[PDB]
Nucleic acid binder design. Structure first.
Ligand SMILES: Nc1ncnc2c1ncn2[C@H]1C[C@H](O)[C@@H](COP(=O)(O)OP(=O)(O)OP(=O)(O)O)O1
Ligand SMILES: [Ca+2]
Ligand SMILES: [Ca+2]
Ligand SMILES: [Fe+3]
Length: 1107
DNA sequence: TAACCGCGTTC
DNA sequence: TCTTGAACGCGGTTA
């Protein structure tokens, strides 16, 4: 059966591997002792491991399961080696005394597919006295291949389903071996993952392949250098529509191979032949490019494959090439009678992504999506190049790409080549090191380490730990179909996450004094503290001792004097210090501090009870109204899906049930969802097997290593003499390099926290998550309470606070120790950190000291620390249009040298908002730095405001036509296709429908469409979603333009098709206006400054308050 | 007005 | 099949 498909594929894969330089190396035999102490002596071939794939092998009966491993050797070559390993899962019993009798049943029940049984023991974290050494007994079923593993699962699931059902009825007037199978375990482990965990093999490491197995050569340091190729394809595009592989033909393919690289053109569309040129967008990224101009498009495709076959690439990189480039090449090869798989060994997979056996396909867009830490608006290759490589790549409008084949062809070749070098160097500088390093710790292959979710990455790491501590894997979590609370059906439950406050809007600059009120008891509190806080700063914050530091007293005194001056001069009008405090890796450090772990929460010291906040959303329907709505739906007739209500799937029954319960409650209450929050407590055992905390602690330290290096090189740039341009160039590049790495790790890191609530998680715990958050809320609010009493907090988000402090507040001091060095001290930082460590430290942390006698020690752990960045030059916080409301998660901060430090939330960064507001915000925030007074500052920003206002009061006359197209467009995206939005009205939704009638259904075929639209004045007083014109229409033929423009404005006889007359300038004027009141005018009000843009009227509530 | 939704950010 | 979390701003509709 289905075996045949698999052994066939393995045969084909083997042939391609052979062709591309990957023969199966079988190592010599060896009958001597096999330890890694004696590596050079054992017969074998040492290689660097690049890939991993599951394969089936013949007797070299029904197929044997194994993994092919792809190595690069030290003699400039390549080989492949094969490990076989029997797939296995476990059967668990609800009575240990009778485990043997289950074997005699499953040995006969699964005679059809099982190779061997065995009785094994594992630690089960859900078992009593497991921390005393008691272990759970299990039956290890092993198999010859993975299909036979699957068969046994199909045979076991009825037994497991039946066992969960009540036994039948024979003699009512007063156990079976089957009824003792409690569950199956570790049945859903991907096979090749099972091999890399059990065999501790990882891609990126050096091994010598020998008869006894793989031997890691810890003596080889640096990775081998695989031959990496990146490629870009550009194709013809019929105007305003999209590129279709059926009709459109490939124009040219640009690529690079280890620095060199090439262009190949289809001269049947490229209006001439081409000369060898060079595009070196900066010296770091050379690019001398030969060309092969070819006659036919099939000559082009054959040239590409022929080149690939000759160079033998272990890595092929692209940019979104997974879903555009590779499928386009395949259909074009198919049309032209070329089978891609026989040519370069590539083919789509079950998710429709293109893979090969010998060569990993590295789609940089997957890196950019997961690990670049870039906003979505900055996730196109243009912005990625500017951000990560530091240069501006060649821009060329698509609509011109097909025409410029004939008109300006050498220019187009200069574009296609830009995308090529930008992705090769993006891969080599960022994707290649990070991904391949990750493979050395995560048991997946490059293609998987690149593409899988960060929660899955965590899961992989955690499974290694669980396995190597002999801990039995929990089965994947399963959310119930219905959960209830006080007799109400629950629509959603969750915990209360981060705590964030908007406290104050306006402008704050270091050269413009503000007024502070200082709580005198607060400074009296700090004074009865800083003796032990400065000791804290040396003994805990710098791992030193006061015994070896000299000027302890002198520093203790400077600060005290300053504090005293502030205690008598409570009221002051001084120049501010703009600071930011942030806990380093707050949630990770919170989990490790508290030994937080899904396996650590229980019911029924050894007990650290911590509180969390549960919040449910339910219907106010009581059960009586639910049971009523159900049987009502039971009697009705329902369409099939290729029947009765009870013949539908239980899932669909609740789908219908939810809809009917939604409408019924709105009648009886009009209140459809009720939201309640409950304080809850959970116990957190302090002695549980800490395999989870430790996995987090390790990955944190791993990340901290790169965040530390960034701080190191940010310093090394303070001492770079501004003349030596080459020194500061390399320093600035190292920093971009280590900020990237540290941020790439950050998402994976905090995914250890989110994993606890991920669907299908093996370590689910709503409790642990809520505890993590509520504690974070408590720490951040304790920190705000102090700064409030000693300064003005501006904004606060979960773990960070932007605050303003007098200039007379103690900031930075430098101890001097006997070794001559120095120790940094930010008093505002260690001020909070000492209170953190007085009020949140875990004194109940326990750990195995003597494992043989199960003896535990108790100590105190706390790894929660604020860090400061600052002082900054300016901060600009917007305000809400409503009264008494602020705006969170939006602001602009400026560094001393006038550069932009942080720019949060605003539309300029978000993906495809209204370009007008984007350009306005880009032009506005730098201007807040000008002026000599606060009143003078707001005037400068007022001038640029009115300039933009004049643009719109003039009905857009100052802009040439090529410039107005951009300023008024709003380009928003559609997560799904149009058919999936039925019953919904939005501006994207009508823009897509109209783009569909006008250009064909072929346009909203795919998901993720960029709807570039314009709001029209007509029809008048119609809802704004009705008057949404696709910007594309203004570029079609006047026949088409007029018919639809008349349709979409319901003005059936209209002749003024000029774009300027269609636009609803009052709409855009209202939108720019809202921007100006939120960023400029209403902030100017709460700071005590009359309106600086009088053409934007204050709201009626603020016109009421000024009085 | 208040509830509610899709998107895309800040944590 | 694969799949980190919650809090939030803002257009815009709906009750
Ligand atoms: N992608 C994310 N997934 C889950 N939680 C996140 C994510 N991003 C931020 N957080 C959560 C966990 C964080 O500990 C917490 C605070 O975020 P944040 O201050 O930006 O970074 P961090 O404190 O975790 O690292 P850093 O040292 O860079 O400050 O919010
Ligand atoms: Ca391209
Ligand atoms: Ca932080
Ligand atoms: Fe306990």
């Amino acid at each position: 059966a289905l075996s045949a498909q698999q052994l066939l594929n393995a045969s084909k894969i083997d042939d391609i591997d052979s062709m591309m330089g990957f023969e199966r190396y079988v190592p010599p035999q060896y009958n001597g002792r096999f330890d890694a102490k004696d590596i050079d002596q054992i017969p074998g071939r040492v290689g660097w491991l690049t890939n991993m794939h599951a394969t089936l092998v013949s007797q070299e009966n029904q197929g044997i399961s194994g993994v092919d491993f792809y190595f690069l050797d030290e003699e400039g070559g390549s080989f492949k080696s094969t490990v076989v390993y029997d797939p296995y899962f476990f059967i668990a019993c609800n009575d240990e005394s009778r485990v043997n009798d289950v074997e005699e049943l499953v040995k006969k029940y699964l005679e059809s597919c099982l190779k061997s049984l065995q009785i094994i023991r594992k630690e089960d974290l859900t078992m009593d006295n497991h921390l005393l050494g008691l272990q759970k007994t299990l039956i290890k079923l092993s198999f010859v291949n993975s299909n036979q593993l699957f068969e046994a699962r199909k045979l076991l699931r009825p037994i497991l389903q039946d066992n969960a059902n009540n036994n039948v009825q024979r003699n009512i007037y007063n156990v079976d071996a089957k009824h003792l199978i409690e569950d199956i375990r570790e049945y859903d482990v991907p096979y090749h993952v099972r091999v890399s965990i059990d065999k501790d093999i990882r891609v990126g490491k050096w091994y010598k392949v020998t008869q006894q197995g793989f031997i890691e050569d810890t003596r080889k340091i640096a990775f081998a250098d695989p031959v990496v190729m990146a490629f870009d394809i550009e194709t013809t595009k019929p105007p305003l529509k999209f590129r279709d592989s059926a009709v459109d033909q490939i124009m040219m393919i640009s690529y690079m191979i280890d620095g060199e690289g090439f262009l190949i053109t289809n001269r049947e569309i490229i209006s001439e032949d081409i000369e060898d040129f060079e595009y070196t967008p900066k010296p770091e990224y050379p690019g001398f490019f030969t060309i092969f101009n070819e006659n036919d498009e099939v000559a082009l495709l054959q040239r590409f494959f022929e080149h690939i076959r000759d160079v033998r690439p272990t890595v092929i990189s692209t940019f979104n090439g997974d879903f555009f480039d590779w499928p386009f090449i395949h259909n074009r090869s198919k049309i032209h009678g070329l089978d891609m798989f026989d040519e370069i060994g590539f083919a789509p997979d079950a998710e429709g992504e293109y893979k090969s056996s010998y060569c990993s396909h590295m789609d940089c867009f997957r890196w950019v999506k997961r690990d670049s830490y870039l906003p979505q608006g900055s996730q196109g290759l243009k912005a990625v190049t500017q951000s990560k490589l530091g240069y501006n790549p060649i821009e060329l409008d698509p609509e011109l790409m097909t025409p410029y084949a004939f008109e300006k062809p050498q220019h187009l070749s200069e574009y296609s080549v830009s995308d090529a070098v930008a992705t090769y160097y993006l891969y080599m500088k960022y994707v290649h090191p990070f991904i391949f390093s990750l493979c050395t710790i995560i048991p997946l292959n490059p293609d998987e380490t690149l593409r899988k979710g960060t929660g899955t990455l965590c899961e992989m790491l955690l499974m290694v730990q669980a396995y190597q501590h002999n801990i039995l894997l929990p089965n994947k979590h399963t959310d119930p179909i219905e959960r209830f609370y006080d007799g109400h059906l629950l629509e959603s439950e969750t915990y209360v996450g981060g705590h964030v406050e908007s406290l104050e809007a306006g402008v704050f600059r270091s050269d413009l004094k503000n007024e502070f009120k200082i709580d005198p008891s607060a400074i009296d509190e700090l004074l009865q503290e800083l003796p032990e806080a400065l000791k804290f700063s040396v003994e805990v914050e710098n791992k030193s001792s006061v015994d070896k530091v000299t000027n302890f007293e002198e520093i203790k005194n400077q600060i005290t004097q300053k504090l005293l001056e502030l205690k008598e001069n409570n009221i002051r009008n001084e120049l501010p210090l703009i600071y930011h405090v942030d806990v380093a890796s707050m949630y990770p450090n919170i989990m490790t501090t508290n030994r937080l772990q899904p396996d650590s929460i229980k019911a029924e010291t050894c007990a650290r009870k911590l509180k969390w906040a549960w919040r449910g959303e339910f219907f106010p329907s009581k059960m009586d109204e639910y049971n009523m709505i159900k049987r009502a739906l039971q009697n009705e007739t329902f369409p099939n899906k290729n029947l009765t209500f009870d013949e539908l799937s239980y899932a669909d029954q609740v789908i219908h049930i939810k809809k009917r319960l939604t409408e019924y409650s709105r009648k009886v209450y009009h209140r459809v969802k009720v939201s309640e929050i409950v304080e809850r407590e959970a116990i957190v055992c302090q002695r549980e097997n800490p395999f989870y905390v430790d996995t987090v602690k390790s990955f944190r330290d791993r990340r901290y290593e790169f965040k530390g290096l960034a701080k190191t090189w940010k310093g090394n740039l303070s001492k770079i003499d501004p003349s030596d341009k080459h020194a500061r160039d390399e320093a600035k590049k190292m920093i971009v390099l280590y900020d990237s790495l540290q941020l790439a790790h950050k998402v994976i890191l905090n995914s250890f926290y989110g994993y606890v609530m991920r669907k299908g998680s093996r370590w689910y715990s709503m409790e642990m998550a809520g505890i993590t958050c509520l504690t974070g809320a408590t720490i951040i609010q304790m920190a705000r309470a102090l700064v409030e009493r000693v300064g003005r907090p501006l904004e606060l988000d979960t773990d960070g606070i932007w605050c303003i402090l007098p200039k007379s507040f103690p900031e930075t001091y430098f101890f001097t120790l006997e070794n001559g060095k120095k120790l940094y001290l930010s008093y505002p930082c260690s001020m909070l950190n000492y209170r953190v460590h007085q009020k949140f430290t875990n004194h109940q942390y326990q750990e195995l000291k003597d494992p043989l006698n199960y003896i535990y020690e108790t100590h105190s752990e706390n790894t929660i620390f604020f860090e400061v960045d600052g002082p900054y030059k300016a901060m600009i916080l917007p305000s809400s249009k409503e009264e008494g409301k602020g705006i969170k998660k939006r602001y602009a901060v400026f560094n001393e040298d006038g550069s932009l430090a942080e720019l949060k939330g605003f539309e300029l960064k978000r993906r495809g908002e209204l370009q007008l507001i984007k350009n306005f915000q880009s032009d506005i925030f730098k201007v807040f730095l000008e002026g000599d007074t606060l009143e003078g500052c707001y005037s400068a920003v007022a001038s640029v405001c009115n300039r933009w206002l004049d643009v719109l009061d003039s009905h857009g006359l100052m802009l040439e036509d090529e410039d107005l197209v951009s300023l008024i467009c709003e380009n928003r995206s559609m997560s799904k296709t149009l058919k999936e939005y039925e019953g919904q009205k939005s501006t994207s939704i009508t823009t897509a429908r109209r783009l569909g009638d006008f250009l064909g259904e072929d346009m909203v075929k795919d998901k993720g469409l960029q709807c570039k639209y314009i709001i029209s004045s007509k029809p008048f007083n119609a809802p704004v979603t009705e008057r949404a014109i696709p910007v594309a229409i203004f570029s079609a033929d006047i026949p088409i333009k007029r018919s639809f423009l008349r349709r979409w404005t319901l003005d059936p006889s209209l002749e003024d098709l000029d774009i300027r007359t269609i636009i609803d300038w009052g709409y855009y004027r209202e939108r720019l206006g809202s921007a100006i009141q939120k960023i400029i005018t209403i902030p100017a009000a709460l700071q005590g400054v009359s309106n600086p843009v009088p053409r934007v009227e204050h709201p009626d509530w603020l016109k009421r308050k000024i009085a």
